Amino acid sequence: DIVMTQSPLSLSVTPGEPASISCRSSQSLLRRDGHNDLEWYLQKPGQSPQPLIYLGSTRASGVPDRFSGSGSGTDFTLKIIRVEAEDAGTYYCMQNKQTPLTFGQGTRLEIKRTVAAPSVFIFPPSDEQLKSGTASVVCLLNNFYPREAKVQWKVDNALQSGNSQESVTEQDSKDSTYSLSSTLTLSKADYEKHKVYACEVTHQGLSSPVTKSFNRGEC
Amino acid sequence: EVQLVESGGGLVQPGGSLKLSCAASGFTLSGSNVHWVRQASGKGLEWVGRIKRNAESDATAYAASMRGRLTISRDDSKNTAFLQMNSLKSDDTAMYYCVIRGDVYNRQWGQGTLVTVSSASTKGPSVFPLAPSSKSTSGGTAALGCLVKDYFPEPVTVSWNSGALTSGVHTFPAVLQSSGLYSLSSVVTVPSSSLGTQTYICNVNHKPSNTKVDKRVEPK
């Protein structure tokens, strides 16, 4: 099988600045006609891969001037002359010379933007969830940059360790930010045994960590 | 119009079989080479196999990893391509994509169909509101949502106000809980001045268990 080695595996570029991705083929992809059996795909968050370049350098329909494929034989480059927020996603090179078709590891393009502190919201268990015999406390960290964020949970000043799960959305295609949900799982009996539910957030965009809390039974 | 309908996916037990379908609309499949590519959650792209066009003797090739477990065919009378996968293992769990290599829909990929190879049974989700309150207000902005808990397998689709509400929406990736069941939250940030007047419904559909719920999220 032809091996496709992509480089780098990730990069963070500020909009308006250029981006370059390398792809090395283990075998010659050069055709008799001067082209190469090399393609470039972009996969945006929550989407299928989409063609960008084929025949090594031909732009796919609707793909703008700012995107270019170059190289020959074994060494390939995808260039984005001017990076845009919409470009956020994973880029893959692919050989279509022969079967099996083979792809590179993929390159995640992060759109670099200005540091943005999260907006923090806390949701007690719903009365309807409590009715079903279960309790989930949700802490929301909205629209922040960079993605590195830390959430600490305290229940009556007791640090919670192992009873929470986090989920981070992919980089937003428009505003270049991330969002995080942290869920604290407890039994209804434990939820009812305590008063203060606190979510502590640490992020580059906050001078000091921010705490959002509620008291069970509004107390 | 040009379209690629994908189905035949879903939940299957280890050792089981699945027949994926790739239905073409607006163009004739017999004139195109149809490929299949998979992607495990958070992973890269892996070619599975292909079927060449009629003018290319309907020639089939398959990935070495899928060692004599695959059968690609076409029903030209139905204008559909099929990927038959036998003796499925947990590592075959992935989104499977139908890829057209031809005149129309050239190097374009279908939306894909998710294949889950697991011994766990289907479970419809519980849908709970994440009501807006003072604790979920920051300045002149309020956040609200829906907790989509305890379902299996993936996927779950969530929309707001039947697709009319999209701005400020974050449907979080599902996290697999210790129970072996998934859970996700879908949230919206809205103006707080709209809390008592505008209605916010979340439309949840877990197709694997035929669970569709329209849940109104009200303040307090």
Side-chain angles (χ1 to χ4, degrees), chain A residues 1-60 62-209:
Chain A
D1 306 347
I2 297 172
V3 180
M4 309 299 288
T5 316
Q6 263 186 87
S7 194
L9 295 180
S10 74
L11 76 172
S12 197
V13 175
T14 128
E17 299 257 278
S20 175
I21 306 161
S22 293
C23 180
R24 182 179 83 247
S25 182
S26 78
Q27 286 180 221
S28 184
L29 295 177
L30 189 67
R31 300 166 52 93
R32 274 163 278 195
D33 73 358
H35 295 303
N36 290 263
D37 286 325
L38 178 95
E39 307 180 353
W40 287 103
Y41 292 92
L42 161 60
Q43 184 171 36
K44 286 177 178 194
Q47 286 187 32
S48 300
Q50 79 193 62
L52 299 176
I53 297 283
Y54 57 95
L55 291 156
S57 64
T58 307
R59 256 174 304 123
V63 175
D65 231 349
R66 42 188 206 94
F67 289 90
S68 80
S70 62
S72 235
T74 64
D75 237 294
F76 300 99
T77 312
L78 175 72
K79 291 173 191 69
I80 315 175
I81 199 266
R82 219 170 290 100
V83 140
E84 238 95 87
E86 88 168 307
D87 303 337
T90 308
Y91 295 79
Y92 295 88
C93 64
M94 186 203 78
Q95 68 81 23
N96 62 284
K97 183 196 194 177
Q98 55 194 54
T99 254
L101 305 202
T102 57
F103 299 88
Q105 306 82 329
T107 298
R108 191 181 35 80
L109 174 65
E110 188 179 70
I111 300 308
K112 199 183 289 173
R113 53 105 84 220
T114 56
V115 168
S119 303
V120 193
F121 310 96
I122 188 167
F123 295 97
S126 64
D127 285 323
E128 36 279 93
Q129 188 188 10
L130 294 167
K131 219 207 108 178
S132 76
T134 233
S136 296
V137 189
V138 175
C139 189
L140 167 66
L141 281 64
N142 215 48
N143 302 343
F144 64 90
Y145 191 84
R147 60 110 45 77
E148 299 74 43
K150 184 223 153 182
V151 4
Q152 179 159 279
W153 280 111
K154 286 176 129 220
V155 173
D156 284 339
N157 306 278
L159 169 85
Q160 300 302 294
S161 188
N163 30 49
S164 62
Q165 276 177 309
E166 284 182 0
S167 193
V168 187
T169 59
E170 289 183 68
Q171 194 175 39
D172 185 270
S173 284
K174 196 156 151 277
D175 69 18
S176 304
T177 66
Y178 295 93
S179 293
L180 187 154
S181 84
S182 181
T183 309
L184 183 74
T185 305
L186 24 46
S187 64
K188 180 181 178 172
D190 293 346
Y191 178 69
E192 291 174 344
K193 227 184 277 265
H194 303 103
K195 192 191 257 189
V196 190
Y197 294 80
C199 180
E200 192 200 67
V201 176
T202 312
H203 183 87
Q204 197 182 137
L206 305 159
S207 60
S208 234

Side-chain angles (χ1 to χ4, degrees), chain B residues 50-53 55-61:
Chain B
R50 66 101 163 105
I51 186 152
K52 286 196 152 268
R53 77 225 244 241
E56 291 205 71
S57 305
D58 288 340
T60 66

